[PDB]
Structures are given as structure tokens and as C-alpha cells.
Amino acid sequence: LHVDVPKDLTKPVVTISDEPDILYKRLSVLVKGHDKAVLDSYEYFAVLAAKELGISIKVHEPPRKIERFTLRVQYEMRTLYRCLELEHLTGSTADVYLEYIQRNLPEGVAMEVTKTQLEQLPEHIKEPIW
Amino acid sequence: EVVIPKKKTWDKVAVLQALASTVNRDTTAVPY
Amino acid sequence: HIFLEKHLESFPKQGPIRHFMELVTCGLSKNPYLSVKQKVEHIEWFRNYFNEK
Amino acid sequence: TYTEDFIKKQIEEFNIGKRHLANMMGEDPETFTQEDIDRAIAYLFPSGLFEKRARPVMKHPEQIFPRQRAIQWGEDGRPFHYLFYTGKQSYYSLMHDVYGMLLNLEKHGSRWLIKEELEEMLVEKLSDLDYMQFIRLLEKLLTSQCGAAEEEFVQRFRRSVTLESKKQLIEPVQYDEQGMAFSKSEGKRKTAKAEAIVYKHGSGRIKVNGIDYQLYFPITQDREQLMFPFHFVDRLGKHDVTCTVSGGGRSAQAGAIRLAMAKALCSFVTEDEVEWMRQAGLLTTDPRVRER
Amino acid sequence: HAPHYIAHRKGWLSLHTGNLDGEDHAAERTVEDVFLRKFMWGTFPGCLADQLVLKRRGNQLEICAVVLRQLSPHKYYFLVGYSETLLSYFYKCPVRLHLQTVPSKVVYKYL
Amino acid sequence: LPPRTEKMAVDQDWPSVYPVAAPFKPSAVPLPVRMGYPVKKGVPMAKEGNLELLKIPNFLHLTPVAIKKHCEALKDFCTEWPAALDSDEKCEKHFPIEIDSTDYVSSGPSVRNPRARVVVLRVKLSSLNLDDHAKKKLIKLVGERYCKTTDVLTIKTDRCPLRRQNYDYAVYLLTVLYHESWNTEEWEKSK
Amino acid sequence: ADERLRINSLRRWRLSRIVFRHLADHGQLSGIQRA
RNA sequence: AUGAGGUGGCAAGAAAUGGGCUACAUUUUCUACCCCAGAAAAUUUAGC
Ligand SMILES: [Mg+2]
């Protein structure tokens, strides 16, 4: 579009509720795939998006696994891994980032996200019962 | 002091709508 | 899901059915695949079966 | 067969596609490079295929499209080369030049190029006997007092080779907090994996998983295996070793430790001693493992 | 290409996470692919120049097929609508088709 | 009819062409990308009709320009980490309990994964108001769930079908464990 | 079924090997390559 | 009656060869340890 542009855009409604949000110490994202190049491109995408969203992210590569089996005709499965550990992000930032990167999850790539929520002691445990 | 910020709740399709609002119409293509 | 021993009230309280059924409900309480309704119906089936016997 | 117009259109299309890719990836089109092309095409089109050729590639057109359309005469029909009617103008021209050089000289680590490489450079097929004849002429030129120009002309025809002693990696020397120099290394034998640290100065104390070697290795064979590296280079009682081994059995662990400790000791000995240790079979991982 | 180039020169037609370690329902995905290939080859007879590509994103099932330009475009549209709707109601998921017409079969070599 | 890439300008807005994940369209991608092992005195196959380029899970819909534009519009949905929690050291101080929960992204018609019900509660015993006897009793109640090196007690709950139920069960277990460690029975006298 | 389980208390692709091979050999089974 | 029942019986013996399962030790066995202790007592067939 060079002249014909939308005049105004209806931004989605984001209401600041009154409840307190969940806090996450850590958010570890283990993506498993059959191709290393796909996982590398996904790593680039996720890391970049985290950078423009302000989230602190570190990347490492868990060791690959192979499942071999025979019918002699010998078939193979390779699983390669990429681990994206995000740190110090709230509930909403984590939620939106995860929605984005899960909707942009490529083919053959499964995801395992572990979220490490932070909580305070129950009031039943601050003092003993008398 | 740990000031826990407030939850922001958005309707089920907010993220898709924002992403779509980022993208303009394609001039050189027929409709989708 | 964890405390299903309140369905064992109509059974023998100290005989060997108490043993068998307490251990049964211990088994059921560790089942994550069933809902409460199926567990209760299963306990009721044992109720019946022992009552005919 | 590809016409020149086809290649020209491919060149124009490649330029337009390069600018399009630069626009896509956010870089400036003016400074966008071929390494950038490779990185961007790999990212946009991920591929795990092992064959690098099979992976998607965007290249300059001429790099793929080959060409061997050497025309040997013009519109009038006159051949360009005065030796054309021999059918082997390039080969016989080269032979003529060599003969002239030999006449002039008479008046006054590497290998010979293989037959197929001479074919590729001459862009003409030749038999085996004529390649022998050319190599004989080249050797004759070498025997005479060839000058600098003739030496360069010969060097056009002699390829290179390499060795397998410079590929021996000598680990760097590190320093601990106390200021003691040391060197670290790894070794492998069957399922046993060893990680050794050799100190420059010592009293011959070897600690295997924090345990003295004569206690960790009751069997004399393993102690001899640990002795072999230092005894070979005559440095018994001159170094301290701290090594950690895991997996395998007693003998696999001893062999892995021997390999790791020899690879660490390579840092404190002379290059001659490193080569001797290599030739004794000390710096080579043993690939013999259990078979299915 | 022979089978032993499936990860060297050839790729994979069907792509899904089922076979990965820990992931489940690989057999179900295999049966889905078998039925789906049979039905595509039975619904577009003599049109498919090349095998399908069955991609999966969550529920989505993208059938990226390569077809020819012999049959009239209206029949392509009619068949695309029919097959999408029937497969969506058969697999209970949002199936989609991405036909790519070619003037003729794209030969690689001769064997 | 001719492909529409001829109409695409060299300074056009790329994200508009491929807003979302879409297959490879050689009639829409304005690139002379070739893919394939060439035959003897041959070339890698052109894009038109190339099945291999269509089999790639392409990232044309996610370019750096598109990614930056998307993340610029998605900033509105984000909150801010409480600045007081500058690092871990204050993070296990103000918020001792750590609850780990897992979610799985597969591909298929069913979203159910039985492994998502597991919940892991981790709390350092030094943060619990325990005396010497209570700490001893708690540690030798839990057994292997407590690691001496780390001073961390880890309760893994997977009995209940849901995840909220398992989280509640873990909290309940910790509650009863604290109360029964702070209790001295009759047999406790004969240590 | 359930009755049978109760009285007891009181006391990879699901295809034929060849059909697997054809799909596996043609690249129709994802991630299953030949060693 | 190729259906449903009842009354009795039936539960083998001998070789020559083919195959298979067990224990078969002093460079062994039992205890402690995982290796410096104490007590016991002819044809063939494959394989590198
Ligand atoms: Mg009988």
C-alpha cells in the first residue's frame, strides 16, 4: 500500500486487572526436532523476540539422542534439542511471549516449557498451631 | 519492597489481532 | 481423589474386608486416569459383590 | 545447452533477487554479500540434509552453469591456433614451448600433476603415453640448469602435499591460582573417559579420582600402562598428575588415563619428543570397540 | 532417489512430531497419512504430478500437493472445497489444501 | 499467465506478502533459489515445481523486519518484573517456594498430554520456622526428598488428574508435614 | 472388562512390517531414515 | 442329529537314529573384598 492505507486501527483491549500476577523465576523451553537447521532458525527467532520484549534469555544445546531399530534393514531416529532458559519475567510477559513463539512453532518441532513460579509461605506455616 | 504488578487480561484473540494490525494489505496479490 | 476411605463406612470395620478394601482405596487414590465418579461406582460394585456373598 | 542470453537473464534475475533478499532480511542492499546470502537462505529455508549441495542454495549463475563452448575458428573459418589441425593444439603447443626452453637451456613435498589435472588445465583429452612423454620432458628440463623462469614454469606443473605431524595438537599451558603451570587433556578407551591435568613440576604423584594410583590400580599391568608415557620420554618422578576417569573397566580406564596424560605431557616436551610419542602409538585414540 | 537418501538428498513428505522421543500417537499419524494419500490420489486422478506434503501445526493439517494444468480450474476449486470439508469432518481438525499447478511433470533424470 | 513476482517492487513491504506461516510459492517468492544435487553437467532444480523447497518448514513469514514489527506491537501486552528482585539472592529470600509445572506442544487433533499434571514444589528448609527437633523430624520424615547438600525439600505430586489439584495436594502435604514435625508424640520421648 | 478386572482383584506404528518399509523407504514416515 | 445328555472304557510297549534341557572342579569352590586374605577339596564342527 502506497496511498491506500487504513486510517485507524482497532488495537486489542488489554485491561489492567486488579489481581496480582504470577512471578516466574525461570522458564525453560526445550524444543526437540529432527533437523538442526530448523532448530537453529527457531533459536534465532526466539532469542530475537525475547530481546525486543526485554526478557533475559540464555541458550544451550542439550545432547542429541538416536533411537536405532532393525526389521538387516536398520532404521534410525535422530532427536536434537535446544534449550532456551528465560529468567526474571512476570506472568503476562511470559504468557504473551509463549503464545507468540508457540504459534510460530515450525513443523516436526515439539515443545516442552517448564515454568518455575514463585510463591510465599501459606499463613498456616508462619507459626505453629497452639 | 516487592511490588507485584497487576495482571493484564486480554480477550482470546488479542495477540492475533495485534499481529494482523501490524500487517497491511498486499497490493500485488489477489484476495486471500 | 486422595481420601476415598469415606466410601468404606458400610463395610466391615475390622475384618479382612477392611484390609482388602482399605488397600483397594489406597490403590484407587493413586490413579490419575479416573474421575471420582468411576472410583465411587467401583467401590459400590465391591459393596454389592460382598453383600451377595 | 544454455545460451548467452539465458545466462544474462539469470544474472539480472540474480541481482534482483539479491536486492529482494536484502530487503527481506533488513540489511542494506548495497553492502549485502554472498556470505550474507548463504546465511539468510539457510535461515529462511532451514535444511538438515547432510549433503551440503542438496541444501537450498542461492548463488551467482555462472558458478553452477558450466561452460566448455570453446570455438576454435572465426567467421572466415581460419583456425585461431597454428597447431589446430593436429587436433591437440594445446598439448602440442605446450610440448613445443618445453622443447624450445630445452633448446635455450642447452645453448646456455610435491608431486607431478596427475593426468586428469593436465586434461583439465589444457581443456583437451590426452592419452597416457603422451602424458608420459610430457612428464619426461618436464623431468629433462628439471635436470638441466633451469633458471628462475623455467623453475616457475615447472612449478606450474607440480602440485603439493602435506604431513601428519603438524596436525598433532599441543595443548596450551595454563596457570593455577598458586602460579603453577599445568596442562589439561582428555582421553578415551572403549567406554572409559579420562580427564588429566599434568603439572610442569612435581614429584611423580599421580592422583586418580583423588586416590593414589597404586591404590586405585591394584593390578601391575595398569600401573605399567600409567608408567609408559613418562618412561618413554624419561620424565619419571618429574611431574605431578591429577586425573579423573569414569566408565569402562580397569584396563579401559588405564588406557584412557595413559592417552590423556600423554596428550597433556606433550606440552612440556620437545617437538622431537612429541613426534616420538606419536610414533610409539601413545597419542592415538584406540578405535577398537565392541561390535554388534 | 533411493531410500537411503531420505536424510542426505531426499527429504520427508509427511512431517509431524509423533515419532519424537516422548511424543505419542505416531501410529495414528501414520494411519492418517495413509488414508489421506489414498484419498488425495483418488480425488484428483491423473492431476497430481508429484507426491503430497502433509504438514502439521497443532490441529492444522496442510496438504501441499503438486498438480497439473490439464483439468479445468473450476474443477480444481470444486474438488479443493470438497476435500477440505470432508477431511476436516473426518479428522475433526482444520484441514487445508495448497495446490501447486505445474505445466508438466518436472523430470530430474532418466532411469 | 505470468507469475506475480514480476510486479513486486524491489522496495516493497515483505511482511504483507506472507503475513503468516504459508507454504513455499515459487510464483510469490521473488528469489531465484535453487535446491537439489545437480546431475552430471547439470544444475540444481529450479524453484518452479520443486518439491524439496516446498517440503522445507520455511521462515519467510518470520523475517527480522517482520519480527521487530510484531514485537513492537506485542509490547502492549507485557508487565514489568518487580525491580526489587534484582537477582536470585533476593528471589529465594522474598519468595521461597518454587513450583515447577510443565506444558507440552505436540501436533495432532488432541491436546491432552498425561505428563502435564505433574507439579514439583521446592522449598529450602532453612526458610521454614523450625527448631532443631522439628528440622530433624522433617528431614527424616521426608527421607530422600530432602537433599543435604542443597537444603532443599522437593515434593513431586502427580496423583490427581489435573494440575491445580496436584498443586493443592503438594501445598497440603507441606502444610501437614510442617504441623506434624512441630508435634511431639509420646513415642517421641524415647529418642 | 471392568467386571473381569474386579474379580481378578478379589483373587509403534501399528502397520505391517512391509507396509512400514514402503512408507519408511519412500520417505513417508517422518524422521525414520536408514542408518 | 454334524444338537443336548448319561453309563463304562481309553491314559500304550520296544528299539535305531535326529533334535533339545540340566551338572560336569583345582587356571576349581565357599566367605570378606572387588584382585597382597582365610578355609574347602576319532572324526568332524565353527572361529579368526
Ligand atoms: Mg486320552
PDB file of C-alpha atoms in Angstrom, chain D residues 29-244:
ATOM      1  CA  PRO D  29      21.193  -3.901  -0.389  1.00  0.00           C
ATOM      2  CA  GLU D  30      24.392  -2.054  -1.304  1.00  0.00           C
ATOM      3  CA  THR D  31      26.614  -3.872   1.212  1.00  0.00           C
ATOM      4  CA  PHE D  32      24.756  -7.202   1.059  1.00  0.00           C
ATOM      5  CA  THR D  33      27.236 -10.019   0.410  1.00  0.00           C
ATOM      6  CA  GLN D  34      27.329 -13.657  -0.673  1.00  0.00           C
ATOM      7  CA  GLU D  35      28.113 -14.924   2.826  1.00  0.00           C
ATOM      8  CA  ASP D  36      25.057 -12.941   3.899  1.00  0.00           C
ATOM      9  CA  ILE D  37      23.159 -14.643   1.068  1.00  0.00           C
ATOM     10  CA  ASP D  38      24.177 -18.067   2.384  1.00  0.00           C
ATOM     11  CA  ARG D  39      23.264 -17.216   5.977  1.00  0.00           C
ATOM     12  CA  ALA D  40      19.909 -15.696   5.012  1.00  0.00           C
ATOM     13  CA  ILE D  41      18.932 -18.548   2.694  1.00  0.00           C
ATOM     14  CA  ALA D  42      19.881 -21.065   5.389  1.00  0.00           C
ATOM     15  CA  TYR D  43      17.746 -19.234   7.961  1.00  0.00           C
ATOM     16  CA  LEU D  44      14.689 -18.673   5.760  1.00  0.00           C
ATOM     17  CA  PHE D  45      14.837 -22.230   4.353  1.00  0.00           C
ATOM     18  CA  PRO D  46      16.212 -24.457   7.134  1.00  0.00           C
ATOM     19  CA  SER D  47      17.573 -27.789   5.939  1.00  0.00           C
ATOM     20  CA  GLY D  48      19.122 -30.691   7.834  1.00  0.00           C
ATOM     21  CA  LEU D  49      20.290 -32.580   4.743  1.00  0.00           C
ATOM     22  CA  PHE D  50      23.847 -33.822   5.191  1.00  0.00           C
ATOM     23  CA  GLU D  51      24.808 -33.223   1.551  1.00  0.00           C
ATOM     24  CA  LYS D  52      25.694 -29.527   1.504  1.00  0.00           C
ATOM     25  CA  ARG D  53      24.881 -29.485  -2.217  1.00  0.00           C
ATOM     26  CA  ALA D  54      21.375 -30.807  -1.545  1.00  0.00           C
ATOM     27  CA  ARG D  55      20.676 -27.942   0.847  1.00  0.00           C
ATOM     28  CA  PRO D  56      18.967 -24.944  -0.818  1.00  0.00           C
ATOM     29  CA  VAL D  57      21.492 -22.559  -2.351  1.00  0.00           C
ATOM     30  CA  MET D  58      21.332 -19.116  -3.962  1.00  0.00           C
ATOM     31  CA  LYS D  59      24.497 -18.472  -5.978  1.00  0.00           C
ATOM     32  CA  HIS D  60      25.798 -16.361  -8.819  1.00  0.00           C
ATOM     33  CA  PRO D  61      24.552 -18.050 -12.026  1.00  0.00           C
ATOM     34  CA  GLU D  62      27.934 -18.783 -13.619  1.00  0.00           C
ATOM     35  CA  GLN D  63      29.087 -20.751 -10.567  1.00  0.00           C
ATOM     36  CA  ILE D  64      26.559 -23.511 -11.333  1.00  0.00           C
ATOM     37  CA  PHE D  65      26.051 -23.195 -15.090  1.00  0.00           C
ATOM     38  CA  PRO D  66      29.222 -24.761 -16.585  1.00  0.00           C
ATOM     39  CA  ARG D  67      30.684 -23.788 -19.971  1.00  0.00           C
ATOM     40  CA  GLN D  68      33.004 -25.629 -22.364  1.00  0.00           C
ATOM     41  CA  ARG D  69      31.980 -23.873 -25.600  1.00  0.00           C
ATOM     42  CA  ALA D  70      35.496 -23.138 -26.871  1.00  0.00           C
ATOM     43  CA  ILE D  71      35.208 -22.046 -30.509  1.00  0.00           C
ATOM     44  CA  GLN D  72      38.402 -22.702 -32.462  1.00  0.00           C
ATOM     45  CA  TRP D  73      37.782 -20.663 -35.634  1.00  0.00           C
ATOM     46  CA  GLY D  74      36.110 -17.428 -36.684  1.00  0.00           C
ATOM     47  CA  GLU D  75      33.588 -16.484 -39.342  1.00  0.00           C
ATOM     48  CA  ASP D  76      36.131 -16.749 -42.169  1.00  0.00           C
ATOM     49  CA  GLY D  77      36.807 -20.315 -40.998  1.00  0.00           C
ATOM     50  CA  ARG D  78      40.509 -19.766 -40.344  1.00  0.00           C
ATOM     51  CA  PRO D  79      41.522 -21.509 -37.087  1.00  0.00           C
ATOM     52  CA  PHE D  80      42.976 -19.290 -34.384  1.00  0.00           C
ATOM     53  CA  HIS D  81      45.824 -21.638 -33.406  1.00  0.00           C
ATOM     54  CA  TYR D  82      48.601 -22.561 -35.829  1.00  0.00           C
ATOM     55  CA  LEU D  83      48.609 -26.150 -34.470  1.00  0.00           C
ATOM     56  CA  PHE D  84      44.844 -26.560 -34.897  1.00  0.00           C
ATOM     57  CA  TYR D  85      44.895 -29.373 -37.457  1.00  0.00           C
ATOM     58  CA  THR D  86      46.810 -31.651 -35.078  1.00  0.00           C
ATOM     59  CA  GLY D  87      43.579 -31.844 -33.075  1.00  0.00           C
ATOM     60  CA  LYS D  88      45.588 -31.369 -29.858  1.00  0.00           C
ATOM     61  CA  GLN D  89      46.688 -27.759 -30.280  1.00  0.00           C
ATOM     62  CA  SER D  90      47.017 -27.060 -26.545  1.00  0.00           C
ATOM     63  CA  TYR D  91      49.047 -30.181 -25.765  1.00  0.00           C
ATOM     64  CA  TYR D  92      51.370 -29.855 -28.755  1.00  0.00           C
ATOM     65  CA  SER D  93      51.796 -26.122 -28.166  1.00  0.00           C
ATOM     66  CA  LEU D  94      52.879 -26.920 -24.611  1.00  0.00           C
ATOM     67  CA  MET D  95      55.283 -29.579 -25.896  1.00  0.00           C
ATOM     68  CA  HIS D  96      56.666 -27.095 -28.429  1.00  0.00           C
ATOM     69  CA  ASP D  97      57.232 -24.495 -25.707  1.00  0.00           C
ATOM     70  CA  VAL D  98      59.001 -27.045 -23.499  1.00  0.00           C
ATOM     71  CA  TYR D  99      61.210 -28.121 -26.406  1.00  0.00           C
ATOM     72  CA  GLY D 100      62.121 -24.500 -27.105  1.00  0.00           C
ATOM     73  CA  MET D 101      63.011 -23.962 -23.451  1.00  0.00           C
ATOM     74  CA  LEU D 102      65.217 -27.058 -23.533  1.00  0.00           C
ATOM     75  CA  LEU D 103      66.945 -25.774 -26.670  1.00  0.00           C
ATOM     76  CA  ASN D 104      67.596 -22.428 -24.975  1.00  0.00           C
ATOM     77  CA  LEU D 105      68.982 -24.062 -21.827  1.00  0.00           C
ATOM     78  CA  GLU D 106      71.210 -26.331 -23.921  1.00  0.00           C
ATOM     79  CA  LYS D 107      72.519 -23.221 -25.680  1.00  0.00           C
ATOM     80  CA  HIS D 108      73.259 -21.775 -22.236  1.00  0.00           C
ATOM     81  CA  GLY D 109      56.728 -32.440  -0.532  1.00  0.00           C
ATOM     82  CA  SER D 110      55.330 -32.237  -4.054  1.00  0.00           C
ATOM     83  CA  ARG D 111      54.043 -34.431  -6.872  1.00  0.00           C
ATOM     84  CA  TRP D 112      53.746 -34.277 -10.630  1.00  0.00           C
ATOM     85  CA  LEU D 113      50.335 -33.150 -11.823  1.00  0.00           C
ATOM     86  CA  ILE D 114      48.091 -36.130 -12.476  1.00  0.00           C
ATOM     87  CA  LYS D 115      46.847 -36.911 -15.976  1.00  0.00           C
ATOM     88  CA  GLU D 116      43.319 -35.653 -15.306  1.00  0.00           C
ATOM     89  CA  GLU D 117      44.578 -32.354 -13.898  1.00  0.00           C
ATOM     90  CA  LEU D 118      46.631 -31.797 -17.050  1.00  0.00           C
ATOM     91  CA  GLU D 119      43.461 -32.603 -19.002  1.00  0.00           C
ATOM     92  CA  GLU D 120      41.506 -30.004 -17.045  1.00  0.00           C
ATOM     93  CA  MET D 121      44.155 -27.305 -17.447  1.00  0.00           C
ATOM     94  CA  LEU D 122      44.690 -27.984 -21.172  1.00  0.00           C
ATOM     95  CA  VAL D 123      40.935 -28.447 -21.756  1.00  0.00           C
ATOM     96  CA  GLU D 124      41.819 -31.390 -24.012  1.00  0.00           C
ATOM     97  CA  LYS D 125      41.710 -35.158 -23.637  1.00  0.00           C
ATOM     98  CA  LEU D 126      45.085 -36.873 -23.955  1.00  0.00           C
ATOM     99  CA  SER D 127      46.219 -40.487 -23.800  1.00  0.00           C
ATOM    100  CA  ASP D 128      48.601 -41.988 -21.256  1.00  0.00           C
ATOM    101  CA  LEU D 129      51.697 -42.247 -23.452  1.00  0.00           C
ATOM    102  CA  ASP D 130      51.659 -38.569 -24.397  1.00  0.00           C
ATOM    103  CA  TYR D 131      51.306 -37.651 -20.714  1.00  0.00           C
ATOM    104  CA  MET D 132      54.348 -39.853 -20.027  1.00  0.00           C
ATOM    105  CA  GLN D 133      56.178 -38.018 -22.813  1.00  0.00           C
ATOM    106  CA  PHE D 134      55.296 -34.619 -21.350  1.00  0.00           C
ATOM    107  CA  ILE D 135      56.426 -35.710 -17.881  1.00  0.00           C
ATOM    108  CA  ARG D 136      59.698 -36.984 -19.364  1.00  0.00           C
ATOM    109  CA  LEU D 137      60.275 -33.597 -20.999  1.00  0.00           C
ATOM    110  CA  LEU D 138      59.493 -31.855 -17.707  1.00  0.00           C
ATOM    111  CA  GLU D 139      61.973 -34.061 -15.844  1.00  0.00           C
ATOM    112  CA  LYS D 140      64.605 -33.378 -18.509  1.00  0.00           C
ATOM    113  CA  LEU D 141      64.022 -29.645 -18.059  1.00  0.00           C
ATOM    114  CA  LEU D 142      64.385 -30.080 -14.295  1.00  0.00           C
ATOM    115  CA  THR D 143      67.701 -31.914 -14.673  1.00  0.00           C
ATOM    116  CA  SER D 144      69.301 -29.095 -16.668  1.00  0.00           C
ATOM    117  CA  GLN D 145      70.319 -25.809 -15.031  1.00  0.00           C
ATOM    118  CA  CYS D 146      66.823 -24.369 -15.268  1.00  0.00           C
ATOM    119  CA  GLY D 147      66.550 -20.671 -14.453  1.00  0.00           C
ATOM    120  CA  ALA D 148      64.003 -18.779 -12.395  1.00  0.00           C
ATOM    121  CA  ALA D 149      61.586 -18.513 -15.326  1.00  0.00           C
ATOM    122  CA  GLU D 150      61.960 -22.226 -16.045  1.00  0.00           C
ATOM    123  CA  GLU D 151      61.609 -23.031 -12.338  1.00  0.00           C
ATOM    124  CA  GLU D 152      58.301 -21.144 -12.269  1.00  0.00           C
ATOM    125  CA  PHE D 153      57.213 -22.896 -15.463  1.00  0.00           C
ATOM    126  CA  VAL D 154      57.894 -26.260 -13.822  1.00  0.00           C
ATOM    127  CA  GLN D 155      56.154 -25.162 -10.615  1.00  0.00           C
ATOM    128  CA  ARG D 156      53.069 -24.583 -12.745  1.00  0.00           C
ATOM    129  CA  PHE D 157      53.097 -28.385 -13.141  1.00  0.00           C
ATOM    130  CA  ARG D 158      53.934 -29.587  -9.597  1.00  0.00           C
ATOM    131  CA  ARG D 159      51.152 -29.829  -7.020  1.00  0.00           C
ATOM    132  CA  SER D 160      51.590 -30.019  -3.238  1.00  0.00           C
ATOM    133  CA  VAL D 161      51.148 -32.484  -0.374  1.00  0.00           C
ATOM    134  CA  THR D 162      51.086 -32.316   3.437  1.00  0.00           C
ATOM    135  CA  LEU D 163      52.268 -34.215   6.527  1.00  0.00           C
ATOM    136  CA  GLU D 164      50.653 -35.728   9.619  1.00  0.00           C
ATOM    137  CA  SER D 165      52.840 -34.464  12.470  1.00  0.00           C
ATOM    138  CA  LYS D 166      51.849 -30.799  12.467  1.00  0.00           C
ATOM    139  CA  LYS D 167      48.240 -31.930  12.933  1.00  0.00           C
ATOM    140  CA  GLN D 168      49.244 -33.075  16.429  1.00  0.00           C
ATOM    141  CA  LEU D 169      47.611 -30.546  18.762  1.00  0.00           C
ATOM    142  CA  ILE D 170      49.854 -29.369  21.605  1.00  0.00           C
ATOM    143  CA  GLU D 171      47.586 -28.058  24.349  1.00  0.00           C
ATOM    144  CA  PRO D 172      48.299 -24.611  25.834  1.00  0.00           C
ATOM    145  CA  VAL D 173      49.946 -24.198  29.219  1.00  0.00           C
ATOM    146  CA  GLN D 174      47.574 -22.808  31.853  1.00  0.00           C
ATOM    147  CA  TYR D 175      48.394 -21.411  35.294  1.00  0.00           C
ATOM    148  CA  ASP D 176      46.578 -22.217  38.522  1.00  0.00           C
ATOM    149  CA  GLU D 177      45.870 -19.733  41.311  1.00  0.00           C
ATOM    150  CA  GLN D 178      49.164 -20.557  43.041  1.00  0.00           C
ATOM    151  CA  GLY D 179      51.094 -19.675  39.876  1.00  0.00           C
ATOM    152  CA  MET D 180      51.913 -23.284  38.991  1.00  0.00           C
ATOM    153  CA  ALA D 181      51.961 -24.109  35.285  1.00  0.00           C
ATOM    154  CA  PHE D 182      49.951 -27.092  34.085  1.00  0.00           C
ATOM    155  CA  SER D 183      48.259 -28.610  31.050  1.00  0.00           C
ATOM    156  CA  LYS D 184      44.937 -30.412  30.705  1.00  0.00           C
ATOM    157  CA  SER D 185      43.774 -33.082  28.274  1.00  0.00           C
ATOM    158  CA  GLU D 186      41.219 -35.804  27.524  1.00  0.00           C
ATOM    159  CA  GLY D 187      41.479 -39.457  26.572  1.00  0.00           C
ATOM    160  CA  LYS D 188      39.088 -42.216  25.594  1.00  0.00           C
ATOM    161  CA  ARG D 189      39.271 -46.018  25.587  1.00  0.00           C
ATOM    162  CA  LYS D 190      36.191 -48.185  24.994  1.00  0.00           C
ATOM    163  CA  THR D 191      33.535 -46.635  27.302  1.00  0.00           C
ATOM    164  CA  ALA D 192      36.137 -45.178  29.688  1.00  0.00           C
ATOM    165  CA  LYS D 193      36.688 -41.416  29.547  1.00  0.00           C
ATOM    166  CA  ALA D 194      39.631 -39.749  31.292  1.00  0.00           C
ATOM    167  CA  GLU D 195      40.486 -36.119  32.025  1.00  0.00           C
ATOM    168  CA  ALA D 196      44.064 -35.485  33.141  1.00  0.00           C
ATOM    169  CA  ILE D 197      45.999 -32.479  34.449  1.00  0.00           C
ATOM    170  CA  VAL D 198      49.804 -32.614  34.304  1.00  0.00           C
ATOM    171  CA  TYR D 199      51.821 -30.092  36.308  1.00  0.00           C
ATOM    172  CA  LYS D 200      55.124 -28.841  34.935  1.00  0.00           C
ATOM    173  CA  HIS D 201      56.962 -29.591  38.195  1.00  0.00           C
ATOM    174  CA  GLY D 202      56.231 -32.432  40.574  1.00  0.00           C
ATOM    175  CA  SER D 203      57.481 -35.480  42.431  1.00  0.00           C
ATOM    176  CA  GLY D 204      55.760 -38.260  40.490  1.00  0.00           C
ATOM    177  CA  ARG D 205      52.487 -38.180  42.430  1.00  0.00           C
ATOM    178  CA  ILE D 206      49.502 -39.398  40.392  1.00  0.00           C
ATOM    179  CA  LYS D 207      46.023 -38.983  41.895  1.00  0.00           C
ATOM    180  CA  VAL D 208      43.273 -40.993  40.183  1.00  0.00           C
ATOM    181  CA  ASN D 209      39.860 -39.770  41.382  1.00  0.00           C
ATOM    182  CA  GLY D 210      41.617 -38.340  44.422  1.00  0.00           C
ATOM    183  CA  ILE D 211      43.204 -41.731  45.179  1.00  0.00           C
ATOM    184  CA  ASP D 212      46.856 -42.673  44.811  1.00  0.00           C
ATOM    185  CA  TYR D 213      47.456 -44.733  41.695  1.00  0.00           C
ATOM    186  CA  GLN D 214      48.880 -47.790  43.452  1.00  0.00           C
ATOM    187  CA  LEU D 215      45.643 -47.879  45.470  1.00  0.00           C
ATOM    188  CA  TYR D 216      43.300 -47.102  42.574  1.00  0.00           C
ATOM    189  CA  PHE D 217      45.060 -49.651  40.315  1.00  0.00           C
ATOM    190  CA  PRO D 218      45.960 -52.826  42.240  1.00  0.00           C
ATOM    191  CA  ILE D 219      46.934 -54.692  39.062  1.00  0.00           C
ATOM    192  CA  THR D 220      50.539 -54.182  37.977  1.00  0.00           C
ATOM    193  CA  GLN D 221      49.529 -54.056  34.306  1.00  0.00           C
ATOM    194  CA  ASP D 222      47.598 -50.818  34.821  1.00  0.00           C
ATOM    195  CA  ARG D 223      50.487 -49.272  36.753  1.00  0.00           C
ATOM    196  CA  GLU D 224      52.790 -50.162  33.859  1.00  0.00           C
ATOM    197  CA  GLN D 225      50.295 -48.553  31.475  1.00  0.00           C
ATOM    198  CA  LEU D 226      50.435 -45.371  33.547  1.00  0.00           C
ATOM    199  CA  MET D 227      54.237 -45.591  33.638  1.00  0.00           C
ATOM    200  CA  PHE D 228      54.686 -45.969  29.863  1.00  0.00           C
ATOM    201  CA  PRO D 229      54.214 -42.281  28.873  1.00  0.00           C
ATOM    202  CA  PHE D 230      56.800 -40.843  31.292  1.00  0.00           C
ATOM    203  CA  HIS D 231      59.272 -43.696  30.961  1.00  0.00           C
ATOM    204  CA  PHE D 232      59.251 -43.305  27.184  1.00  0.00           C
ATOM    205  CA  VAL D 233      60.391 -39.663  27.407  1.00  0.00           C
ATOM    206  CA  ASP D 234      62.407 -40.156  30.635  1.00  0.00           C
ATOM    207  CA  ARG D 235      60.373 -37.925  32.930  1.00  0.00           C
ATOM    208  CA  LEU D 236      59.562 -40.317  35.765  1.00  0.00           C
ATOM    209  CA  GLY D 237      59.301 -38.539  39.096  1.00  0.00           C
ATOM    210  CA  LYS D 238      59.396 -35.103  37.442  1.00  0.00           C
ATOM    211  CA  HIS D 239      55.646 -34.422  37.077  1.00  0.00           C
ATOM    212  CA  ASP D 240      52.529 -34.451  39.233  1.00  0.00           C
ATOM    213  CA  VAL D 241      49.290 -35.715  37.691  1.00  0.00           C
ATOM    214  CA  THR D 242      45.687 -35.271  38.824  1.00  0.00           C
ATOM    215  CA  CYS D 243      43.281 -37.272  36.671  1.00  0.00           C
ATOM    216  CA  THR D 244      39.582 -38.127  36.836  1.00  0.00           C
TER     217      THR D 244
END
